[model samples]
Target: QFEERHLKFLQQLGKGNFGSVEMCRYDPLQDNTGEVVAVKKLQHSTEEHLRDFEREIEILKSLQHDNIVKYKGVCYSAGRRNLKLIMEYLPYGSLRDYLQKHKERIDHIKLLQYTSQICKGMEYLGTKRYIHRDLATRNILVENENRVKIGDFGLTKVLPQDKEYYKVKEPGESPIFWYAPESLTESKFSVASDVWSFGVVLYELFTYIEKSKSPPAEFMRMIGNDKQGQMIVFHLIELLKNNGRLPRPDGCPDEIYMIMTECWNNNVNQRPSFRDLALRVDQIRDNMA
Candidate 1:
């Protein structure tokens, strides 16, 4: 549990559709000494928004892994509209920002290391039967020059014990570019669909390292003239149906690009499991030495 009195807001970190993340000083002992942490608070108090926030809290509380963001505590007031979630603060910020800021300085080896870390984290999530519906570079946080952790559980879902996929009856706003074909057209999500999103994240990692390129912009250019939500997704589905895929980033190794293609396979059954991916990434890193 957390209290408003123990938190000293430092600055606003980032704002999403439903909440704002703020950097703060947590002083449990109150000796003028405390550690920095990130607090997520609702931007609006609608019932739907509150339910999503509470669901995120429940999911975060159950996750425990080095590559997954740490959950500190939560502050819930009598009003229920003033709920706040506390989590570990990664000073280096999101991987997307870090790559853009230090594009010229990052090397292929470092990108591979980040990829391996992400795979390990996803493997853990897979073991727990959680589908991180939104996996991308923007949601990954940089802890230091060499460490990254998966964050943003706002759209995650836990699979039922007997079900292989979670079917979405009414799909809401989604990141279509990162979605698998089955997910985009069939409204289904499983570990395999998450693997496809991981491939898009890999594309972001390699492309974002170039000062002149952006994954989203490149995707936009590919689906030219179809700007509306449904139209854009329709074109993307057509493109995928015809086997269209993003080109390999400049200087990215063939082996790594091959992994991305495997993940993006139209036949979901052919995609590698997260555990297999983790070992493959480890082997790739070793072979590079």
Candidate 2:
């Protein structure tokens, strides 16, 4: 039986409201070097939190894609004192961290590479009738060779085959800048909103490159933090509402900017689906190559 004891914690990767994610070596009680995994633990978890945690597990269990993080399963300690989430360890960290560090110098080819993977993953999710309500650079992870995989589905929704819209019950606390206008107003979650968030993520990817001057040291620091990200600025929602668009980031190409603008269309009907975005990204990849 796999318990918290079976996992040998190595390093603390991150901490959030629910729990801490650790770099751990899982010992299946076999005599070997064992496997390293990212272990997420819940702290003082309420029943609601527990239900959410289980839901995340269920979603991951049924979904599989090369561009999606692998779920290794869940584990609990004796008497369920400590619960653990076992998953593949992405050593390079999140796409946000990667882009933030290399923003000023990230090559177009590499950017297209990661973008292609993300779009492919989202397309896969669309085929499954799932909506990843929390799609952002911070939720996209980096692997070796600059590969990326979509990570974290704690806010995901699985829509029925005939249903197109999944309304948010509580709406709760979610990032404003990443949400589509309709989602903010109607508390509705749909592929349209997901496309809107994907557009924001593209903006995030280009923010550093588009800067007139390399961002200030402290400003770059803020951009890297999940809570204080570059996109999550003050008056963002109001500004978007008033202007119908964000000022283009420095160094962004006319073509990419066009895609971003289309994604942020006020009429969700105009936004391109993830499959179309995937094809567009592949075209970029080919052109950049």
Candidate 3:
């Protein structure tokens, strides 16, 4: 249990995209629990970003899984005039850091196993029809070596699956580095889109670099400024418009390549649903002999 900290700062653990996460050990009688916990406070917040902030918290509330991060409690204080998220402390740190420490070389077996675990979490989100628009190493937190959970659903949204993102014509914003072609190009996204995003994340998971090895064209399409009115930018989006083969990772399996390629096809019709993707990864797991 945690109560208002009547004490000074104990220590700082880490900081993130929008807030700072700190650790404090308090007395059970004075605070609430003798158990220490991490406190994440939004250092800066404004009316413009409030909705997005609340939406992220909503996503946290919607999610429930052992591999996912736990939500302890939240605080809204007039003193700080900000929101605070207190949750279970993950001492092992993020998967990104873990991978870096391991020398960042993921062999075929690790790729399969890791991707499978990511799929397990994504499959749950798919069941809820939630698209984890942002999926990358930095977003994947390592609770411990064996327990890796997906977090940061800031760009997460339910699919307007039947509709095309191109049809909307507003400024499209998503995690560009691990973004799928459909989402980056036309704002097209769904459970299938999430699968595509995860494929890129899979590639990132298996490698240390940010650039793709396949089609140099697709590589260029994954970034931009929100104000750029252009529907698509970068060489890859242009080349992909003509329908091209993505550059393949050197050591990835043929089947996995096919799975990733299909997820990014120009035609969303060709993309596999996240549910189907879960099965594919599972079958791959079983097929390993």
Candidate 4:
């Protein structure tokens, strides 16, 4: 648990809030070649922080699924006073990077497959009473041949049976575009809100197939990478607050858009569950076949 000699750390893989995640080799010996793993190292850790870190490990350890990133082990030392999480290294990277790399070029067959996997992963979390408050394409990990798994569980919460809405005590720093209208009113979190974010993810995924170089001007104003994009997104959120919905992307299959619209329902209770989402995507996959 506290030994540092077993693993040899290498280049930085990605950055997180606490510290940078690094790629590590299992054995440091010059002649020993071993498997690679990703490690998240915390900085300036305290006993309180260590307790929270242990809590996260307990939660992650219980979640076992093909669509969820596997946790390997943890490394600690009295000197660094830092906590490190060793996890499976996803070679294909994140769904966000994949979307950017193949923007608009991925065919419907592959897109349906990717979306199906995402829904299944989320369905598993929901069954476990876990709420992925930040569920988005960026949080999804990709593997070769379009394999996808849910990652980035830093904001995830275990929902209590008695709570209808798991209130987020932490303030601000939320993804506004992916938020449900009820987030500001009812609660910052709910399985219903997760449904809303899933819909937003589908929107991003469908738009990846560049039917138009850009989406409709209104959507571009809300989602575009421009100086005024944040303002536009906020403005659009206000409209959503008043029951408005984002327009469907051009060339999006009518069936798929219908499912997305259901997820964006103004009434959180009316939003589809992840179970239904997976079923619907399954249907779409079969239709494509």
* Backbone N/Cα/C clashes per model: 0, 2, 4, 3
Model 4 ranges with Cα > 4 A deviation: 28-30, 43-50, 209-237
lDDT of 1 by residue, 1-289 (tens): 8788889999998877577899999898998689999999988788877887888899899999989999999987776559999999999999989999998888888898999999999988888888888899989999999899997888888898989999874436678888899998988999999999999889889886454456556667787755776778888899899888888998888998999999999998999988788788889888879
Candidate No. with top TM-score? 1
Name model 2 segments beyond 4 Å from true: 30-32, 169-172, 209-238
- Candidate 2 per-residue lDDT over residues 1-289, each given as its tens digit: 3566678889997665466778988887656578989988787687887888777778887889999999888897656656677899999888877777776667777777788889888988888888998888888888865789998887888887777989875424666657888787677888899999898888777775344422222233434335354354443444456645655676778888888899998887999988888788788778766
How well does candidate 1 score on lDDT at residue 110?
A: 88
Candidate 4 lDDT, tens digit per residue, 71-90? Answer: 98878787646678888888
Q: Where's the lowest-lDDT run of ten residues in candidate 1? A: 208-217
Select the stronger candidate by lDDT from 3 and 4. 4
- The sequence of per-residue lDDT tens digits that candidate 3 reaches over residues 76-194 is 66554577666677776667677767644545565566677787888888777677766777777777656788855656676665643322223344355465666666666676667
Residue 137's lDDT within candidate 1 is 91
Residue 256's lDDT within candidate 1 is 89
TM-score of 1: 0.94
**Candidates sorted on lDDT, descending:** 1, 2, 4, 3
lDDT, candidate 3, equals: 0.64
